[PDB]
């Protein structure tokens, strides 16, 4: 289960970080080079099978990574993300035992690589299923292995946010930014070359007279992006940073020093749910991967419990889909909080052993009553911390003020926690 | 204020680029007639007539010009004073700005030679 | 079978008040500073705009 495949599968690993340990800004150089790569990585593929729909999970799928039928971004970091998540599951859930020898953590990274590359191969096979099928597979793995190396050289390396989450964040910055300035529009019944940019809604004032019907197309534009959409997008950003500052303060007499009070906080977003939203995303990505195996042996009847109902009309033609979608969103993020905290740290025993491990004792009571001091916060500030993100992303969909939705709310939440992490070392 | 300088350098490539060809607007780049086989490959900057441009020609020219000037701004505003990090940040600044200066002038020299057919 | 619902709904209204609810100062700092940090990651899309579609014209045209 672990003792056999892991010792053989060691083929082509990564090089661990050097002895140039403490530095400020060459850290940021190792970030920026990867950001040059994902300038470059979102670029066009070499095969001319020009299929009509771009991707089938293109919208939710697009929210996670937006190079749908596009570049070497490979339709998602969904290999590394899904393969990381179920790995940490099956380490934390004791279906498979825990490895804490350094050989076992190294081969744990090896098996991480294994499931990641196998899932890349799975996505490759499932998107390509003509006679031109050569060398696509070679390209994808080469560009799967590259994202692998760039992520694991930004965990043991620079890594502060992750490799992963800041990729998602910057690509979400771009997906707002193509909506920010928009050069082309294929010409409709009138009005070429203006699609939901503010330049579009400044060139539109230069072309057309009757500025009332220049305002109306600027603020109630439907098929292209909208500027009412952009107001709602800004509005969501403001509210979500209103809710990041929700934090619980706990003051701490440090042990053996008179009265320094570096109060440990607990923010509600609670790792900003980069598990828990991607928990909400990638299960609904893996079936819309595997509906391709449903074509043989669908986008219709399976969709009614699969997706949002996509309609600005709140009383659109099915309340079943709306109710089940919202209830699944809320329950999914709450449930994956109350299951998530037990593995990636900051559960009750986690916090207790970190604070004893860094000599910080609550004033009110004895050291190992700190558990019962804070066990009445962390699950609820998991669960509510799950819950009122997903309902928050309901407000990211219910009102279309989001450039990309849920995912953009949450990748900028990644950025907001990210700023704290960078600031920490000042 | 210096925002007026920002306004002017904003206006710079804006009226170097295409205000002249706002009303005389000529669409971006396609002019090949199969050349022997392949029909409508978009060509280039215009070359045969000198005064004309397209939208894609002008924007590129404007971009080349303001980056060079603001590279000299960066030479003035930070590289001559001595206050910040005296071995790491400064060396980056002279490095990328000298790269800006040299490769910019080189490529604009190329983008007058190849549309222009001038003896170099 | 009904009471854990009561437990969690009262449990929420506990920890909403215990949180500190930031005011016009820290909100201001992370607000402006992190929209700035956003646009640090942001204009990068305008530079794949300025680059990777015209070089895709170079790609398809040749």
């Amino acid at each position: 289960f672990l003792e056999v495949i892991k010792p053989f599968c060691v083929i082509l690993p990564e090089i661990q970080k050097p002895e140039r340990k403490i530095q400020f800004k060459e850290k940021v150089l190792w970030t920026a080079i990867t950001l040059f790569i994902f300038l470059v990585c979102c670029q066009i593929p070499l095969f001319g099978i020009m299929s009509s729909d771009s991707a089938d999970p293109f919208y939710w799928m697009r929210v996670i990574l937006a190079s749908n039928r596009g570049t070497l971004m490979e339709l998602g970091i969904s290999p590394i993300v899904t393969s990381g998540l179920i790995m940490q599951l099956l380490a934390g859930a004791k279906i498979i035992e825990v490895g804490d020898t350094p050989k076992d953590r190294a081969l744990f990274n090896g098996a991480q690589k294994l499931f990641g590359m196998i899932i890349t191969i799975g996505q490759s096979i499932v998107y390509v299923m003509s006679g031109i099928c050569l060398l696509i597979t070679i390209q994808l793995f080469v560009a799967g292995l590259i994202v692998l190396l760039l992520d694991e050289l930004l965990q043991k390396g620079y890594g502060l946010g992750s490799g992963i989450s800041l990729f998602i964040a910057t690509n979400i910055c771009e997906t707002i930014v193509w909506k920010a300035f928009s050069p082309t529009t294929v010409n409709t019944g009138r009005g070429m070359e203006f699609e939901g940019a503010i330049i579009a809604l400044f060139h539109l004032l230069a072309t057309r007279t009757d500025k009332v019907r220049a305002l109306r197309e600027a603020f109630y534009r439907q098929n292209l992006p909208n500027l009412m959409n952009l107001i709602a997008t800004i509005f969501v950003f403001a509210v979500v940073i209103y809710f990041q500052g929700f934090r619980v303060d706990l003051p701490i007499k440090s042990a053996r020093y008179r009265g320094q009070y570096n109060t440990y906080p607990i923010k509600l977003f609670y790792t900003s749910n980069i598990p828990i939203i991607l928990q909400s995303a990638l299960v609904s990505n893996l079936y819309v991967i595997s509906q391709m195996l449903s074509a043989r042996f669908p986008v219709g009847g399976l969709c009614h419990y699969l997706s949002p109902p996509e309609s600005f009309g709140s009383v659109l033609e099915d309340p079943v889909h709306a109710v089940v979608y919202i209830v699944f969103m809320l329950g999914s993020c709450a449930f994956f909080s109350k299951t998530w905290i037990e593995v990636s740290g900051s559960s009750a025993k986690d916090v207790a052993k970190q604070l004893k491990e860094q000599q910080m004792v609550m004033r009110g009571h004895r050291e190992t009553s700190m558990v019962h001091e804070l066990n009445r916060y962390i699950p609820t500030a998991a669960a509510f911390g799950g819950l009122c993100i997903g309902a928050l992303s309901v407000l990211a969909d219910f009102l279309g003020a989001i450039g990309s939705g849920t995912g953009i709310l949450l990748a900028v939440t990644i950025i907001y926690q990210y700023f704290e992490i960078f600031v920490k070392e000042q | 204020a210096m925002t007026v300088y920002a306004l002017v350098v904003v206006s710079y490539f804006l009226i170097t680029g295409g205000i002249i060809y706002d009303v005389i607007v000529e669409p971006p780049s396609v002019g090949s007639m199969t050349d022997e086989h392949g029909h409508q490959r978009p060509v280039a900057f215009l070359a045969y007539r000198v005064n004309g441009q397209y939208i894609m020609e002008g924007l590129a020219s404007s971009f080349l010009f303001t980056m060079g000037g603001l590279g000299f701004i960066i030479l003035d505003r930070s590289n001559a004073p001595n206050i910040p990090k005296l071995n790491r940040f400064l060396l980056l600044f002279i490095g990328f700005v000298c790269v800006l200066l040299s490769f910019f002038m080189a490529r604009v020299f190329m983008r007058m030679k190849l549309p222009g057919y001038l003896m170099g | 079978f009904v009471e854990p619902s009561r437990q969690f709904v009262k449990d929420s209204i506990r920890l909403v008040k215990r949180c500190t609810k930031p005011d016009r100062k820290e909100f201001q700092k992370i607000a402006m500073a992190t929209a700035i940090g956003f646009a640090i990651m942001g204009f990068i899309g305008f530079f794949v705009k300025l680059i990777h579609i015209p070089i895709n014209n170079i790609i398809v045209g040749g």
Binding site: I15, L46, L72, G157 | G38 | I59, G62
Partner: peptide, 29 residues
Amino acid sequence: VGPVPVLVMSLLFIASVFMLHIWGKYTRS
């Protein structure tokens, strides 16, 4: 990255894509 070749390796991969993209397109038009 004790070494910088992993980056260089990525650059090589893009070049392989970059050059090999137009390399087959050489014989076409």
